[PDB]
Design a protein around this ligand. Structure first.
Ligand code: NAG
Ligand code: NAG
Ligand code: NAG
Ligand code: NAG
Ligand code: NAG
Ligand code: NAG
Ligand code: CL
Ligand code: ZN
Lengths: 194, 597
């Protein structure tokens, strides 16, 4: 019938960096959910408004899938109402979230010896991130009352790389996160299960 | 816009480029020690040097942010840790000279060799040769020869080097706004800017003097007992009212008296506790030892150990194909990598050492949430005390009876606990006067209170006054006996052991009160007690983000060192001792010397 790209987003080869999270807008689908459980023993299947065990029989308009890679400690920050490094400058969920995140441990694919400095995250920003807004700009961060002209004493580069190594604790381990956000609006709906 | 926000941002950059460089360095050190090769030495070097360069540039920036315009205490502490420029204030040539002096002193101590006159080619190292020569042999002359040869062969070499080391360290300390190097060492126990919780650097000297004045009666009773036993073993070489010769203390420098147990046992017929028979009966190994100790730590409420600890840390001798140095250490590589390196054998001593090392690991895991600069013990004495209270609890007969190592038909008597307490006093009490002696001499030699021409005269005089130990042969000013110790010649503060000895018993009493323990303190155990573990974690989680006085009060309810727990621990031993010493003379005289004829 109408297969869904959920398998595609869940099984990509490189999940994007958290500061440049990859968002896809599923619109035309049958919304099968039997294939969701068998991907991996997910570390956090926390759902925020829809019956997690029985997600069928509910029809929405669009389904947005956002792919990250974040530390284990920062997975708890991906929730409607948390504050911190990631949830203020990288990825902020709306207060009225409808959908749920799916985070699983990926250390055999997202970490190498001598560090895997291919995943970044923003730590300095002049303003907190508003919901579902991404800022990939790498402009220098002026932290002092002086016009800055590059990296120096009181002027820092915003992005800080994720050092991932196969020999780190569970909380500093590379965790792949796929956030599913459902929007419902008065419009011809297509994505939902029978 | 303000200095506080700039400091916050700066410390974030540091707290995140620092974790990476410390891992890449700690990992290099770990895989060098676990696998000694030359490629591994070269890796360790590059990584450590990158670490040091990072710390120096970050220190120039931290110097930039003034400390008088900061309200947050945590940021103040982090910057004060960063702003400490150390020896970089000292000029480049003098810094090179100081580094060369330190390296030469450490090297001379490391390869020290003494050759007997019977064979010039036959010489023995301090470790493990002279240690077993003078720590097991009961001959007076051989012990004297080992002591005198080691001192006359390393102290004479180390004297001018120690003079230059003192001079340049004093210059560096005076350049860093300290009165002398001893003040720099005492700067760790210094906390300022808190109402009622401040601790000046001279307050440490005053406190240690008061605690030693309190400790002295127990030590002198123990010394009288030990002198009586040795005089029984050495009939014509020790005066009943004199002082013990420095080489008759069971160790190279007299630091520990544990080797006197065979000579000074209270009751020689009572079997001593030993679970090694049960270890070889039940075929225990390193994995079982560490699993049992982990289960003990869980019983008090502290969490499990990370899976990475079991996966990669080596707990056993890795054959002979690759050599590994395995002095028992607890590595906190950072970012969650907590590992342990020690060669475990089936022995009760290794069992208690595993308990101590995993107590260290528990401490490291507790404050993992603190920023990088504050991920350490509150002072230099907390880590060892926290590690050692676990070994104290793990050696109790109730604990070993619960595990099944001791048969339940074991008979616990007063003589057995007297023997245990005497062994503890030999190990624990016997080193407090020596530690205080050594640190006091180092303070008074760094401060310029004693002239160079009387380094040794004053040293021996105040050793006979404090420890009650005289030299077997007169020494001129050419010798450098204090420099012959490992810690003195490698620039290590020594009062950390004194403070650890006090803090460990303070913590033990505080925890045993919370474990609703009944009876003597030396029998107490904290296993199967969630309240005691919660109380200990309440201080362990702090790290050094708060003054060590507050961390100490959070457990014991006091803001300073007190000695009453130490005597409360040794009360039965103290009573037995002072009952035995009724026919012996306590105290000592400083006039008597072995060579005075
Ligand atoms: C992703 O797909 C490849 C082949 O298409 C397969 O080998 C792999 O197991 C899949 N990964 C997961 C997590 O299902
Ligand atoms: C997600 O990654 C793919 C792979 O390069 C890319 O083509 C796509 O544009 C990304 N989605 C975004 C940036 O929204
Ligand atoms: C120790 O290091 C050497 C050199 O890198 C290596 O050849 C050897 O396999 C290592 N031993 C191990 C990994 O047990
Ligand atoms: C210092 O700053 C930290 C984080 O900004 C904050 O949690 C702490 O409460 C501050 N200290 C004081 C004394 O306000
Ligand atoms: C982890 O801690 C729990 C709680 O006490 C315990 O039941 C479990 O056995 C521990 N894990 C292991 C591998 O022992
Ligand atoms: C601790 O509790 C366990 C389980 O209740 C018990 O088997 C063990 O004997 C107890 N140990 C002590 C010292 O009470
Ligand atoms: Cl000595
Ligand atoms: Zn230790």
């Amino acid at each position: 019938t109408n297969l869904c790209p959920f398998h595609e987003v869940f099984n990509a080869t490189r999940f994007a960096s958290v500061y440049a999270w990859n968002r896809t807008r599923i619109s035309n689908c049958v919304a099968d959910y039997s294939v969701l459980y068998n991907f991996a023993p997910f570390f956090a299947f926390k759902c925020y408004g829809v019956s997690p065990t029985k997600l069928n029989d509910l029809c929405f308009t669009n389904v947005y899938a956002d792919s990250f890679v974040i530390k284990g400690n920062e997975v708890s920050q991906i929730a409607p109402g948390q504050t911190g490094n990631i949830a203020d400058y990288n990825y902020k969920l709306p207060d009225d979230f409808t959908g749920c995140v799916i985070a699983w441990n990926s250390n055999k694919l997202d970490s190498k010896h001598s560090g895997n400095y291919d995943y970044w995250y923003r730590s300095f920003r002049k303003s907190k991130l508003k919901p579902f807004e991404r800022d990939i700009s790498t402009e220098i961060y002026q932290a002092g009352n002086k016009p800055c002209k590059g990296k120096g004493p009181n002027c820092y580069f915003p992005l800080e790389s994720y050092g991932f190594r196969p020999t780190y604790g569970v909380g500093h381990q590379p965790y792949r996160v796929v956030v599913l956000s459902f929007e419902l609006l008065h419009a011809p709906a297509t994505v939902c299960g029978p | 816009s303000t200095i506080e926000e700039q400091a916050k941002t700066f410390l974030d950059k540091f707290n995140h480029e620092a974790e990476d460089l410390f891992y890449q360095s700690s990992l290099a050190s770990w895989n060098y020690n676990t696998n000694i090769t030359e490629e591994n030495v070269q890796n360790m070097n590059n990584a450590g040097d990158k670490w040091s360069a990072f710390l120096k540039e970050q220190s120039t920036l931290a110097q930039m942010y003034p400390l008088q315009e900061i309200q947050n205490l945590t940021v103040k502490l982090q910057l004060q840790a960063l702003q400490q420029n150390g020896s970089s204030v000292l000029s480049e040539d003098k810094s090179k000279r100081l580094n060369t002096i330190l390296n030469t002193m450490s090297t001379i101590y490391s390869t020290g060799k003494v050759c007997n006159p019977d064979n010039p080619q036959e010489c023995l190292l301090l470790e493990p040769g002279l240690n077993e020569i003078m720590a097991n042999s009961l001959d007076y002359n051989e012990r004297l020869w080992a002591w005198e040869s080691w001192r006359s062969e390393v102290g004479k070499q180390l004297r001018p080097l120690y003079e230059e080391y003192v001079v340049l360290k004093n210059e560096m300390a005076r350049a860093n706004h300290y009165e002398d190097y001893g003040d720099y060492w005492r700067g760790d126990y210094e906390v300022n800017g808190v109402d009622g919780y401040d601790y000046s650097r001279g307050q440490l000297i005053e406190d240690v003097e008061h605690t030693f004045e309190e400790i002295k009666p127990l030590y002198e009773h123990l010394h009288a007992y030990v002198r009586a036993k040795l005089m029984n073993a050495y009939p014509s070489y020790i005066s009943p009212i004199g002082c013990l010769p420095a080489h008759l203390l069971g160790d190279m420098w007299g630091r520990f008296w544990t080797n006197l147990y065979s000579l000074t046992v209270p009751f020689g017929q009572k079997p001593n506790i030993d679970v090694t028979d049960a270890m070889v009966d039940q075929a225990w190994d390193a994995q079982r030892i560490f699993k049992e100790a982990e289960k003990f730590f869980v019983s008090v409420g502290l969490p499990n150990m990370t899976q990475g600890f079991w996966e990669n840390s080596m707990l056993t001798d890795p054959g002979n194909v690759q050599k590994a140095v395995c002095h028992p250490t607890a590595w906190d590589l950072g970012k969650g990598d907590f590992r342990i390196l020690m060669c475990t054998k089936v022995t009760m001593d290794d069992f208690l050492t595993a308990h101590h090392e995993m107590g260290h690991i528990q401490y490291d895991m507790a404050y993992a949430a603190q920023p990088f600069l504050l991920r350490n013990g509150a002072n230099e004495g907390f880590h060892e005390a926290v590690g050692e209270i676990m070994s104290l609890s793990a050696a109790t007969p109730k604990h070993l009876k619960s595990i099944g190592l001791l048969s339940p038909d074991f008979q616990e008597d007063n003589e057995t606990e007297i023997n245990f307490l005497l062994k503890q006093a030999l190990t624990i009490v016997g080193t407090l006067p020596f530690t205080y002696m050594l640190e006091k001499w180092r303070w008074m030699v760094f401060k310029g209170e004693i002239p160079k021409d009387q380094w040794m005269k004053k040293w021996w005089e105040m050793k006979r006054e404090i420890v009650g130990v005289v030299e077997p042969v007169p020494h001129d000013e050419t010798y450098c006996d204090p420099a012959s110790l490992f810690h003195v010649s490698n620039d290590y503060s020594f009062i950390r052991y004194y403070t650890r000895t006090l803090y460990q018993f303070q913590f033990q009493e505080a925890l045993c009160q919370a474990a609703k323990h009944e009876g003597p303190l030396h029998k107490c155990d904290i296993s199967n007690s969630t309240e005691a573990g919660q109380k200990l974690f309440n201080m362990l989680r702090l790290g050094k983000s708060e003054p060590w006085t507050l961390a100490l009060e959070n457990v014991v309810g006091a803001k300073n060192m007190n000695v009453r727990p130490l005597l409360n621990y040794f009360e039965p031993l103290f009573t037995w001792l002072k009952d035995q010493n009724k026919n012996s003379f306590v105290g000592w005289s400083t006039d008597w010397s072995p060579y005075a004829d």
